[PDB]
Design a protein around this nucleic acid. Structure first.
Length: 111
DNA sequence: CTGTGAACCCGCCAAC
DNA sequence: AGGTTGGCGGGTTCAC
């Protein structure tokens, strides 16, 4: 029975919502400073970095599986604006959302 | 790009 | 003499 773990699982399932890190902290019955420390010490990353990281990976999935527009995806991935999506996506994957989907559909027409 | 304002987040450290 | 906690300061990142 692990509340730090339970909140991580909860985050994944509920990536599409937008929440304070302070929120996650509360949902894990910890002070911020504890949450922050214990999170990183478990996760390898800090909360909103990990959030971003995860949200991006969901974008990557939707860009592969679905036909939602880049702008429709940012919403489904919890990004507050389509401009933030491009930003974090480009930074950790190496190309824009569209350009990534474009290369994929070409290289792997079949899925 | 540029700019303002808020959020994060990690070292430091006294305090259990 | 081992360890976890949590406010606080404020550079860096995020967001618009």
């Amino acid at each position: 029975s692990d509340p730090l773990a339970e909140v991580v699982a909860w985050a994944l399932e509920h990536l599409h919502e937008q929440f304070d890190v302070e929120t996650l902290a509360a949902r894990a019955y910890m002070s911020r400073r504890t949450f922050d420390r214990r999170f990183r010490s478990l996760t390898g990353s800090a909360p909103l970095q990990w959030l971003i990281t995860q949200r991006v990976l969901q974008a990557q999935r939707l860009l592969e599986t679905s036909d939602y527009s880049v702008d429709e995806v940012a919403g489904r991935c919890g990004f507050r604006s389509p401009v933030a999506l491009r930003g974090h996506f480009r930074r950790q994957l190496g190309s824009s959302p569209a350009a990534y989907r474009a290369a994929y559909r070409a290289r792997r027409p079949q899925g």
